[model samples]
Target: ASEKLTFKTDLEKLEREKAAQIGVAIVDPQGEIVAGHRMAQRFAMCSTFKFPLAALVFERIDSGTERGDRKLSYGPDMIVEWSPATERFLASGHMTVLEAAQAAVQLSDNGATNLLLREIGGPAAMTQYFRKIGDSVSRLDRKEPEMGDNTPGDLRDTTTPIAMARTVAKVLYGGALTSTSTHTIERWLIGNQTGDATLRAGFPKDWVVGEKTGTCANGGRNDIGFFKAQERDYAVAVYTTAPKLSAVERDELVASVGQVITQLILSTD
Candidate 1:
């Protein structure tokens, strides 16, 4: 319709001005893609990968393969800086699997990520689950390593924008998880603190977005989540890489992309 054309044209214009090479995918409540570009192209998701890992953890918990209440100790191998949630307990203290999931979502905690990664057998477990379920573009290729110390390249944790959006849509409505597990994951997503300027900031005040953010070297920045309204459900996954852009600038790119998605979703038929 006219609205879809307008939305596409407007974003195409903005794409010209965007500093980063960007990819985006958005889907309606019915699981139809309303707008997108390079959606199937792979990009590093950084900390956003934490969200799927948490989903995996919850699935394991529901199957009794993992226990959310089980305690885990932090040690040298798990030490990672810039982790607001787990850093304080890096050298000591113990936490449950559920707590680690929270730390990873709320703080993008690197150490906590490794702890859970070990539980699921590194990134392979996540990808394996996706493959088992017939979604193959989302992948987890490696564990999180300490930054600036031989850090892995962008290829290690990659996901396609459309795949990420579809994954979130499944989490939101496709019975991809048990209702209880889904609700618990939704709670952690609601508490997500990173990517303040991305999808979370672009949506209306009352419109809750359960999202996860990703940031990595070479200006890789991403956000993926479900945006819900009483009458509507929208999900999006956006990725950007602008090596010359500052942290603030990279986030700004993500915000612009998120805004585009908002417009598209709001005006969709």
Candidate 2:
């Protein structure tokens, strides 16, 4: 009976059990979708947009058109709520592009994210970057804080689970950026400090995971990443929206889904 069950059924069961809307996608090492549920359904991206934004910044760095060490200044007006890392740097009134990118990916710092967004020519340019990289469904329509609003049914700053996974795979492993930039961005993701309670909670200790996390004021929680297992590697995106549930409950749902997808991937012949 278990063997007869598909990931769709299992995920649907989890959604009903957890009282959340869940979207997920798992891609093989070759960038092929192997498992998904509500994969095409749009979910608020929240801070996960920083992942692609960093990729765009790195592409500029790789071309020698942008300097990673270039320092940028900001004042009180630039600081946004929930900016843990950027707040610390405010005393100095500046941070390098590399530091901002690292803060965006590793810490989900809102002010630092806006800095990189400005460097890349604002929110619309970010959407264009996604299109250039072959992702038509993932779009960034606003800057931070405002984007975190995540109004129900609002299409702005939203991405389908499959599209996010595919884009992550492309940037990290599909030759979307040069090898140097790819490795640099991968290292930044590996250093991420925010995902322990979500999808990473379900991963086996032996597996390696590099991830970015996104949280929305409207109860959207997401984690997207690449993982390496004993015999295979994959990219995955898991998004959950459970407005009535507590954050811990939503995190539990994501972790449970991670476990299910991991087992399914390992079982593949």
Candidate 3:
């Protein structure tokens, strides 16, 4: 439909089908945008912020300032309701840093996320870290809300689709962190099986997706990460704010776009 172009027509169709603002960015290993729409518009990070949080934590680990396996005390303030994956830690009152990160990612555990934030010197330091890395538009200004308590005010955590896709590419290609840190972060992402209905649902069997999914109560859903196909590698970020679409429809929308991307990249094959 795009007449040999990247995928403009298919992406436009996806936007129309969803009837909402759908932002996407896909980059190949060579630092080229294979296809994207609204790549510059900002969108809520939601739980997807964990990707950068993991990056920062792993940076400290590489510098010997932190250890992934170090045990950390669990407290009442670290508890975010609705995180069943962390309930066992709450009962035990302790967990290793790596385990907390695993929960924060695989299960989107806000409690574990907050603990990581506190451990990394809070939001200000994290913002500085993002800025230091040459990120101008992405902002990490707010902590994850505690379940249903409504943190209120402006949603300060935001990043554009291209920014997020670039973040994932940096994780995979940039030498910002040690190999051990890269493996630690990459392994956790590969292990993330949440939201199998979104990005995961569209790829060919046996291809690997190292992605992070984010969702808020107000119908904001996002997925960002790498896809390893046998022929080539792609980093993609898709963000949507469709308050009118049901959860199932949202998943289907992502799946549809993901399918198109995979086809576009492999058309030469």
Task: Output the number of the TM-score-best candidate.
Answer: 2
Assess every candidate by TM-score: 0.90, 0.96, 0.90
Span of 10 residues, lowest total lDDT, candidate 1: 146-155
Whole-model lDDT, candidate 3?
A: 0.77
* lDDT of predicted model 2: 0.87
Q: Which candidate is the best by lDDT?
A: 2
lDDT of 2 by residue, 39-139 (tens): 99999999998999999888888888899999988887778987887889999999999999999999999999998887778999999989998999998
**Residue-by-residue lDDT tens digits, candidate 1, 5-113:** 7766766665666655788888875568878878887788778878877888888888889999998877665676665557676555776899889898888888788
Write down the lDDT of every candidate, Cα atoms only.
0.76, 0.87, 0.77
Against the hidden true structure, what lDDT does model 1 obtain?
Answer: 0.76
Per-residue lDDT of candidate 3, residues 74-143 (tens digit) = 7676776646656777777877888888888788788788888878887777777777666666777767
